[PDB]
Design a protein around this ligand. Structure first.
Ligand SMILES: [Mg+2]
Lengths: 390, 1285, 49, 147, 36, 49
DNA sequence: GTACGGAAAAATAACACGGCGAATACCC
DNA sequence: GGGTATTCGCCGTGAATAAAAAGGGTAC
RNA sequence: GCGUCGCAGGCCUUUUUAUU
RNA sequence: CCUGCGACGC
């Protein structure tokens, strides 16, 4: 059909031709020459060469390059036949069927968001206004502020005050699909909740950078917007970052802390043989935090803190105990981050990287999935807080 | 010290003295184009060789001949400044004088006239080419040198690990002749990688018999027959490596018994015995091979043929015939192998004609064989000058590999050349020989602009002489002139094809002078006749030991082409044949001399060269007993009285871009590679800022590039302005006739190739003495003649709340408020008004169906005003097309700016509008002022001469000279006005083209890519306020907070040394500023600056302030109040102890770490942090040019899919890996929505849009259109595929 | 974009997919080598029927 | 002997970097773990390993050739003090080899991943228990040195 | 993360050996040879 | 369909033309091409219901 | 300045590895 | 002379995207 | 809340650079 | 056939 091989116009006025149109023109011209020569009762020698040229023209139209030499026109390059549009990387399968270009998508440079949670990300307002056009149009037509769709389009293009309120209303519980360019496994496309920020960069959580394998030296990521209820439920239940905490290749976690968090938790949980406030009895972790923030006790000082740890060794219920531990000031401050089900022997040592990894493993093994996300978020928060004070 | 360097002297660390100045960096392409473009006799390089290799032209026995006499280049109609603003090619007309003779012999009439054959583009003095207004750079090529090479299979084939050798002859132009082996030990030959043949076929094709073949490749063993006992000739060297199966007997003495091994003591006994005739039994003779044939003088029959085994019956037949001497062949297994014997046994051909038939059948498949056709084909392969040719370097490399004394010869091959190549291949196979490296720089040449231009001119000239011969065959003479035979179409076509659309002809990066000076000095292994970037291999990408001083190892792009795109070194040059060379100081036995010698790659391996940084006793001897040197691709410790040469400098190994990194030896090679790659991507800011920690090579980059205004003649500055600088030339450099002044027109705000702003700012004052070579205007990224690629700010290395998590950079708000990273980007919007049917197009301002609010910015001519802040969706050039329809030029959505310049180009027949008249009036006013300056200077001089003669024919003579000068100036003004109003050429069918330029200022923001000079890149995450940044006890906040976590992992310690040295330099600058702020005298300031310059141990700077005046010391102090620049060399850099002394010179601690207080809370940090100054750079990876978003838009025609790209408002591509990641989940509805509704289904996406607008989240799957296109395309191939139901 | 046309050839032609793609479908059905069919189709040899 | 010298240099550097402290408890000194930033960033596992500290403080050691062999003259200096030209030109071989290997591995990795996906795209869990008795015998793999 | 470019045994600990798939014959010196 | 979309489309389509193959989807890649729910995850429950 | 589109010179150009099928040469 | 069985041609394969130019019919 | 009139657009191949 | 623009009817 002619729409599958069109003749495009140019600015100069000359209509440029394609490869298939040239091959079809060659085949039709050779067939017309053969018919005109057969009408005039030619001898066999000329019509044998004419039938041979028609055979070569048909073979060049079907698959140019198999038999003989591929014909070149004005470019010293082989022409495209009907078989070149099906096979190869630029065929209809790998370029138009297996991988396509989709709507409701964007792309920007990623940055770091320390204040974000594990299930949310920072989305710019200039991208959220473009990716959520018909939702804002439907909400403006429902609220009655714009009866005509052209009035709603002009209200969005003018960027009025209620447009940002509608955009904040249609984004609160609508997830987006963030994706990096090399997708080696299934953790390269995760779902997050958009947070309207000011700027042109995407704020990414620091804990998902190990799963994404993306630092912040110029990396870019693509966003996608689900529209149907089934797609939103598949993003919330299957593709959410809080649901993918174990790798399906071997079972190891993918929410391991990076260098700044383990550096802060290593500097906080250490001790020296002589410091300010060494050798005093403390009544709890709140007095340790008060003595650290008041400037009367160092972060590395061997003290005696009365702790209250819980243990769930019974049939589901938790049993409490109270004793005097020989610990430091920073480990008591980190003990407020640790939940009730975990013991005290996992925090009384110097926290490296595998120690925090096995701490998160023990928390996910004993408590479950829901406190583990809050524990990892609070660990990242206190690591970023105590790496700056050092 | 010149007048430019005396304004601000950079403190130069380093202990090694410089015995050789840094040469001109862009001299390679300039010297190549000078060798190509100049007039040179004796048939050497240039256009003369191309004209002599073609002319004279002979006809087919027509008694006619067209020969070449001389050529002459014309003058360009416009210079470089006008071809860029007009859009034409800066070329020159070629005028060649030919001569046509005719014989009956003798001649009867000679026709001589000048013939014009195309135009060739000239090279700018900076080293560029103007093709269509833009500047291009022809990249040099790195290809294999012509000659002969021997390689090894290294055991890949045959799966047994057997090593196979081969030999190939690569000419400069012609067919290939490759020789190969067999695991069955058979020598083969293949031409142009076709089906292989035995080498005896091409031997017999060169008129060789079997006896001559066995004579050339084997020795003769005389086997004579005596009366009895079967004597034979014995050579004692032939029995080495062979067992003794029989008893060796001679003259009754026993030497070696039966079954005894031959030891060298028995060989020495055979030497001492002096015997050559032993007894051999009959069973040993049958294992030999006969050499030639034997015929009977009485019978006359063929007993045995050549190259066959011996038997007892044929031995008896030679015994009865009376053949005394029998010639055999010597066959061994270590030194002489029977390869040619098995090659003759494999070859079924036994004639020259059959060999020619087989060669014709191999080269021409499917063709009827003919003896004359095979004779014409075999002669036109390696023995015809037209089809085959070897250069002088090819003949030199061919004769050097075969151990020949002569280096001269012909371009075609011969019989003895192929014989010597086969002999060398046989000796390599036997063991006496070795293969050579392909990666060696002595086997690789370097092409340039002139050689490729000469090759394209030769292709054009042979097409022209083909057309001339075909026109001379059909026609007569004595009625025409030699102008119609010469057609200037193929020469101009080949020249425009080479200069316009080529793999090595690319645009020059115009964002930095360093990017230009590294793109011009670029060596590429790709191109026509080179390698391929995806099929190169591991062995060609690594760095060779012969790359020392010739190819930089740390300057290559990372990605698809690593090691294929190399950069030239600083002191590296090019030989006469095309090989690389580096200078070496000649070291005699008495003293290390200073005379340099350019050694090539082959000459480097013979001598031994000491290290670059080897300390001496300042007289010329080595203070160490053993010094580290290199002899043949390896480093070792050598004696004192063993060296022959020495490195001339310590910067000869790195390139120009790699020598701008201070403390390079303290960084890893990967981080240095990343820093040298990212140093070329910087964007110039509003104001240039000098580096506090530099090297000293910045002035060479700023001067050798064409970005600054270098004064041609010294003198006194007469008139200073922001657009022009007038220089009054002194009488010492003035010409004796028509003395004048120099006028430098500064290049103001305009668009470069990378959509950036290039601008020249003046740096001189009124009445300032300048010298020859001093700069007058500072271009982009240039500060007082240095290279200022970025800004230097107060830096700190500490984590700040996770805002510098992986690579992120925390920038303060004072960096944004001072606008020190604001860049100017200029775009170009054109409006082509073409001539079509139904009347032409007009640029009238009366545009229908638009309000007057859009026409308020347009003038009466229809063009937008200069200086109007336009936005997205405004009419710039009002254009209508008669059917009237509207086709005016509008601003695209998303871009904006300010109109700064409008250029209007019109044809000769079309009447110009008011804007073109205003532009021509402004250009005529500028030319009138530029002529009137010299006019009033000469008028003042002539009136001074009138007053001199005054206090009567001399007055009349001077008045006649005054009227002659006025007439000459009027003629020059009329010529300039005619050159202005000469007109411009356009495309056929185009009336006029109007171009609008938009300028915008892009500030810094979170998302931009920042980097340094040590490979430490990052993206800004948050712009922090000034009250939240950490501060010291004095209250000075930090501008940039960096993360120290990347320092142990990525080993780049040079950034911390640069930080400490910049902190010391800023401390010295703040002490100078504190001394200058209070009222201080000149003596204390002078002695403080002298004490600051005298710091260092055994430095070679030696600045003495006794020769400086008080105004010069005050100007130097005002230039040093912002910081003292420090020159830290590449490997001769400053040590840590000198940084300690420089920190003790100020009020700063030696450790470089100070305590800081928090800005948010106010408490002191527990540990001191490293606070200093680091030269930062802003790359061309801004976030406003990368952010894109799309809900709905346009779709394609064939496959109903969204478009691709930001400029077309396209969408992102959901590739196959994202589909696999969605299939790895249970997300089936999301993949169905991505594949059908969001991409393909038109009815599905319209129903989905209507449902989302109405408020329903429900979709219909439908059928994708791409599957229907696939079904229609498979169905057109004659295959029936359909969906059944 | 869905309607097609046809070209009535004056002489029959062989399909290149069922001839050149190894193994040859015409060469295996007729039990003939590919070179002889290439000589017959491109007018270089005769064949008796 | 150069490998033994490099091992002794690394051992002395690690022994100098472990304690590095003479601090008084009440009036007498006592050794403790160092609070150096390099040792704290290399010991906690944040960024960098022991080989990075060996190349930053001790000698770099033996370096290989592009042909595959090892140069007998090693790099007796680190990145803290000044390297000469030969010790940089030696390390450029390994840097270029690593960069070329990283640049050329990705096409083969993508081709292998594409072939594995297209050969294993049609295996979906459809049942719960087919009722079979076949199976493989799980044993720990032993090569001869250790498990 | 992978790569692309190209007489006597000693025990580690104390334990009894286990010889499987071996056919032997007792010699005169008291050693143990393998005929498999 | 899965054999032609991966590699060597010409010989696979030639064998499918000379053999007369009837291709049920029964998989992921065949359902990707025609644009419907794959038999995996929620699409498996859709195919079951 | 409108009109058949081919094949022979072009002073053409020239990858490594692997699987499958055909011409052809050994071995009784 | 039938059954092998090495050789030698030939075809298929060689990651994934964003920007910026240049050319879309040359002859007699 | 839609339909009629007019304008602009839907490309292909090759080369170079940059990023992951 | 789909987008965006300008105009008009009930
Ligand atoms: Mg990155």
């Amino acid at each position: 059909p002619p729409d599958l091989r069109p003749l495009v116009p140019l600015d100069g006025g000359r209509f440029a031709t394609s490869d298939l149109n040239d091959l079809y023109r060659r085949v039709i011209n050779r067939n017309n020459r053969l018919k005109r020569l057969l009408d005039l009762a030619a001898p066999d020698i000329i019509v044998r060469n004419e039938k041979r040229m028609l055979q070569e023209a048909v073979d060049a139209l079907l698959d140019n390059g198999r038999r003989g030499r591929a014909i070149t026109g004005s470019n010293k390059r082989p022409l495209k036949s009907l078989a070149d549009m099906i096979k190869g990387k630029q065929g209809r399968f790998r370029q138009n069927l297996l991988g396509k270009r989709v709507d409701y998508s964007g792309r920007s440079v990623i940055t770091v968001g320390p204040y974000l949670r594990l299930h949310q990300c920072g989305l710019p307002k200039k991208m959220a206004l473009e990716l959520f056009k018909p939702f804002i149009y439907g909400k403006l037509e429902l609220r009655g502020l714009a009866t005509t769709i052209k009035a709603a389009k002009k209200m969005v293009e003018r960027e009025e005050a209620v447009v940002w309120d509608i955009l904040d209303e249609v984004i609160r519980e609508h997830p987006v699909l963030l994706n990096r360019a090399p997708t080696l496994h299934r953790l390269g496309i995760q779902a997050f909740e958009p947070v309207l920020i000011e700027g042109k960069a995407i704020q990414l959580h620091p804990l998902v950078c190990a799963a994404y394998n993306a630092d912040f030296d110029g990396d870019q990521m693509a966003v996608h917007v689900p529209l149907t209820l089934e797609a939103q439920l598949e993003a919330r239940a299957l593709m959410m970052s809080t649901n993918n905490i174990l790798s399906p290749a071997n079972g190891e976690p993918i929410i391991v802390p990076s260098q700044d968090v383990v550096l802060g938790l290593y500097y906080m949980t250490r001790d020296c043989v002589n410091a300010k406030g060494e050798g005093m009895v403390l009544t709890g972790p709140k007095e340790a935090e008060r003595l650290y923030r008041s400037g009367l006790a160092s972060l590395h000082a061997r003290v005696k803190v009365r702790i209250t740890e819980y243990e769930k060794d019974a049939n589901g219920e938790l049993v409490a105990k109270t004793s005097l531990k020989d610990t430091t000031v920073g480990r008591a401050i980190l003990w407020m981050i640790v939940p009730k089900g975990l013991p005290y022997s996992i925090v009384n040592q110097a926290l490296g990287k595998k120690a925090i990894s096995k701490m998160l493993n023990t928390c996910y093994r004993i408590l479950g999935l829901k406190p583990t996300v809050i524990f990892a978020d609070q660990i990242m928060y206190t690591g970023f807080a105590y790496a700056a004070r050092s | 010290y010149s007048y430019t360097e005396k304004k601000r002297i950079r403190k130069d660390f380093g202990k090694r003295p410089q015995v050789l100045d840094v040469p001109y960096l862009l001299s390679i392409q300039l010297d190549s184009f000078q060798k190509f473009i100049e007039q040179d006799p004796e048939g050497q390089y240039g256009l003369e060789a191309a004209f002599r290799s073609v002319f004279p032209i002979q006809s087919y026995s027509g008694n006619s001949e067209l020969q070449y006499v001389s050529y002459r280049l014309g003058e360009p109609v416009f210079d470089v400044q006008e071809c860029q603003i007009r859009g034409v090619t800066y070329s020159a007309p070629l005028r060649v004088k030919l001569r046509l003779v005719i014989y009956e012999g003798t001649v009867k009439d000679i026709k001589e006239q000048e013939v014009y054959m195309g135009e060739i583009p000239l090279m700018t003095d900076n080293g560029t080419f103007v093709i269509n207004g833009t500047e291009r750079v022809i990249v040099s090529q790195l290809h294999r040198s012509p000659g002969v090479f021997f390689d090894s299979d290294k055991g890949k084939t045959h799966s047994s690990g057997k090593v196979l050798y081969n030999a190939r002859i690569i000419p400069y132009r012609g067919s290939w002749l490759d020789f190969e082996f067999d695991p069955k030990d058979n020598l083969f030959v293949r031409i142009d990688r076709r089906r292989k043949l035995p080498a005896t076929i091409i031997l017999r094709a060169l008129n060789y018999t079997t006896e001559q073949i066995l004579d050339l490749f084997f020795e003769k063993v005389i086997f004579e027959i005596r009366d009895n006992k079967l004597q034979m000739e014995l050579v004692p060297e032939r029995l080495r490596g062979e067992t003794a199966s029989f008893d060796i007997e001679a003259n009754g003495k026993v030497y070696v018994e039966k079954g005894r091994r031959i030891t060298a003591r028995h060989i020495r006994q055979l030497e001492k015995d002096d015997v050559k005739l032993i007894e051999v039994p009959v069973e040993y003779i049958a294992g030999k091979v006969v050499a030639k044939d034997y015929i009977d003088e009485s019978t006359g029959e063929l007993i045995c043929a050549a190259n066959m085994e011996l038997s007892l019956d044929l031995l008896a037949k030679l015994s009865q015939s009376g053949h005394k001497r029998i010639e055999t062949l010597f066959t061994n297994d270590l030194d002489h192998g029977p390869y040619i014997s098995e090659t003759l046994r494999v070859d079924p051909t036994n004639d020259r004609l059959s060999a020619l038939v087989e060669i014709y059948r191999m080269m021409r498949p499917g063709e009827p064989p003919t003896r004359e056709a095979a004779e014409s084909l075999f002669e036109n392969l390696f023995f015809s000058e037209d089809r085959y040719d070897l250069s002088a370097v090819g003949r030199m490399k061919f004769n050097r590999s075969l151990l020949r004394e002569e280096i001269e010869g012909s371009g075609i091959l011969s019989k003895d050349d192929i014989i010597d190549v086969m002999k060398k291949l046989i000796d390599i196979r036997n063991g006496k020989g070795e293969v050579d490296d392909i990666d060696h720089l002595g086997n690789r040449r370097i092409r340039s602009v002139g050689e490729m231009a000469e090759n394209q001119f030769r292709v054009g000239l042979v097409r022209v002489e083909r057309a001339v011969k075909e026109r001379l065959s059909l026609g007569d003479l004595d009625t025409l002139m030699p102008q119609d035979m010469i057609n200037a179409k193929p020469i101009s076509a080949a020249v425009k094809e080479f200069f316009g659309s080529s793999q090595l002809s690319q645009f020059m990066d115009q964002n930095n002078p360093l990017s230009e000076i590294t793109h011009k000095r670029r060596i590429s292994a790709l191109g026509p006749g080179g390698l391929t970037r995806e099929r190169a291999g591991f062995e060609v990408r690594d760095v060779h030991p012969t790359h020392y001083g010739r190819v930089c190892p740390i300057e290559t792009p990372e990605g698809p082409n690593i090691g294929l795109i190399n950069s030239l070194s600083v002191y590296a040059q090019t030989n006469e044949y095309g090989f690389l060379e580096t200078p070496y100081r000649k070291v005699t036995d008495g003293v290390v001399t200073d005379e340099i010698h350019y050694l090539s790659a082959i000459e480097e391996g013979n001598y031994v060269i000491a290290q670059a940084n080897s300390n001496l006793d300042e007289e010329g001897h080595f203070v160490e007993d053993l010094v580290t040197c290199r002899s043949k691709g390896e480093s070792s410790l050598f004696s004192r009285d063993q060296v022959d040469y020495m490195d001339v400098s310590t910067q000869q190994v790195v390139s120009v871009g790699a020598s701008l990194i201070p403390f390079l030896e303290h960084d890893d090679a990967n981080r240095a590679l990343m820093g040298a790659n990212m140093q070329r991507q910087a964007v110039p800011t509003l104001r240039a800022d000098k580096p506090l920690v530099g090297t000293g090579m910045e002035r060479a980059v700023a001067v050798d590039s064409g970005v600054t205004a270098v004064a041609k003649r010294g003198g006194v500055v007469q008139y200073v302005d922001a657009s022009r600088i007038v220089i009054k030339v002194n009488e010492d450099e003035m010409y004796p006739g028509e003395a004048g002044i120099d006028i430098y027109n500064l290049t103001k705000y305009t668009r470069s190739n990378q959509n950036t702003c290039i601008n020249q700012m003046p740096c001189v004052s009124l009445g300032e003495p300048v010298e020859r070579g001093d700069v007058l205007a500072d271009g982009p990224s240039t500060d007082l003649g240095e290279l200022a690629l970025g800004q230097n700010m107060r830096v700190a290395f500490m984590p700040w709340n996770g805002y510098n998590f992986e690579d992120s950079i925390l920038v303060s708000e004072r960096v944004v408020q001072e606008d020190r990273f604001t860049t100017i980007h200029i775009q170009e919007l054109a409006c082509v008004s073409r001539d079509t049917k139904l009347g032409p197009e007009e640029i009238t301002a009366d545009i229908p169906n638009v309000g007057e609010a859009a026409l308020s910015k347009l003038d009466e001519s229809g063009i937008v005003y200069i200086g109007a802040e336009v936005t997205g969706g405004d009419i710039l050039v009002g254009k209508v097309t008669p059917k009237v329809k509207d086709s005016s030029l509008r601003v695209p959505n998303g871009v904006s700016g300010t109109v700064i310049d409008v250029q209007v180009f019109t044809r000769d027949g079309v009447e110009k509008d008011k804007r073109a008249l205003e532009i021509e009036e402004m250009q005529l006013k500028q030319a009138k002022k530029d002529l009137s300056e010299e006019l009033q200077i000469l008028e003042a001089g002539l009136f001074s001469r009138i007053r001199a003669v005054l206090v009567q024919n001399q007055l009349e003579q001077l008045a006649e000279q005054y009227d002659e000068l006025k007439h000459e100036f009027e003629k020059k003004l009329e010529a300039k006005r005619r050159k202005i109003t000469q007109g411009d050429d356009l495309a056929p069918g185009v009336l006029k083209i109007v171009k609008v330029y938009l300028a915008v200022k892009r500030r810094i923001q979170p998302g931009d890519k920042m980097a340094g000079r040590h490979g430490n890149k990052g993206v800004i995450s948050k712009i922090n306020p000034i009250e939240d940044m950490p501060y010291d006890e004095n209250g000075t906040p930090v501008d940039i907070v960096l993360n120290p976590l990347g320092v142990p992992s990525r080993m780049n310690i040079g950034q911390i040394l640069e930080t400490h040295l910049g902190m010391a330099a800023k401390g010295i600058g703040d002490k100078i500023n504190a001394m200058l702020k209070q009222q201080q005298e000149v003596a204390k300031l002078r002695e403080f600056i002298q004490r600051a310059y005298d710091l260092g141990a055994d430095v070679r700077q030696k600045v003495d302030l006794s020769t400086f005046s008080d105004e010069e010391v005050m100007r130097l102090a005002e230039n040093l109040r912002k910081g003292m620049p420090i020159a830290t060399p590449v490997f001769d850099g400053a040590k840590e102890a000198e940084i300690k002394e420089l920190l003790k010179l100020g009020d700063l601690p030696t450790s470089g770490q100070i305590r800081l207080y928090d800005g948010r809370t106010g408490e002191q940090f527990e540990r001191p942090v490293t606070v200093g100054y680091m030269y930062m750079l802003k790359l061309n990876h801004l976030v406003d040019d990368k952010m894109h978003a799309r809900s709905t838009g346009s779709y394609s025609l064939v496959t109903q899919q969204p478009l691709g790209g930001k400029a077309q408002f396209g969408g992102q591509r959901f590739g196959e890996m994202e589909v696999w990641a969605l299939e790895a989940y249970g997300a089936a509805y999301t993949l169905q929505e991505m594949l059908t509704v969001k991409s393909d289904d038109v009815n599905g996406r319209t129903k989905m849009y209507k449902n989302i607008v109405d408020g329903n989240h429900q979709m219909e799957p439908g059928m994708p259109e791409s599957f229907n296109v696939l079904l229609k395309e498979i169905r057109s191939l004659g295959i029936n595929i359909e969906l059944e139901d | 974009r869905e309607r097609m046309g046809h070209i009535e050839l004056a002489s029959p032609t062989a399909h290149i997919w069922f001839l050149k793609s190894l193994p040859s479908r015409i060469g295996l059905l007729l039990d003939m080598p590919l070179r002889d069919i290439e000589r017959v189709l491109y007018f270089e040899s005769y064949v008796v029927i | 002997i150069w490998a033994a010298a490099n091992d002794r240099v690394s051992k002395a550097m690690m022994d100098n970097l472990q304690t590095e402290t003479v601090i008084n408890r009440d009036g007498q000194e006592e050794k403790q773990v160092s609070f150096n930033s390099i040792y704290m960033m290399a010991d906690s596992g944040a960024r960098g390993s022991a080989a990075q500290i060996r190349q930053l403080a001790g000698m770099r050691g033996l370096m290989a050739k592009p042909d595959g062999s090892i140069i007998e003259t090693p790099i007796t200096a680190n990145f803290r003090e000044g390297l000469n030209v030969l010790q940089y030109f030696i390390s450029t071989h390994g840097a270029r080899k690593g960069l070329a290997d990283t640049a050329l591995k990705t096409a083969n990795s993508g081709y292998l991943t594409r072939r594995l996906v297209d050969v294993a795209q049609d295996l979906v869990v459809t049942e719960d228990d087919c009722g079979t008795h076949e199976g493989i015998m799980m044993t720990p793999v032993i090569e001869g040195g250790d498990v | 993360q992978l790569t692309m470019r190209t007489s006597s045994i000693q025990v580690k600990n104390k334990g009894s050996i286990k010889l499987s798939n071996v056919k032997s014959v007792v010699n005169s010196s008291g050693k143990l040879v393998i005929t498999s | 369909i899965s054999a032609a979309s991966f590699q060597e489309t010409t010989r696979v389509l030639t064998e499918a033309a000379v053999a007369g193959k009837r291709d049920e989807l029964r998989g992921l890649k065949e359902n990707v091409i025609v644009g419907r729910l794959i038999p995996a995850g929620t699409g498996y429950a859709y195919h079951q219901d």
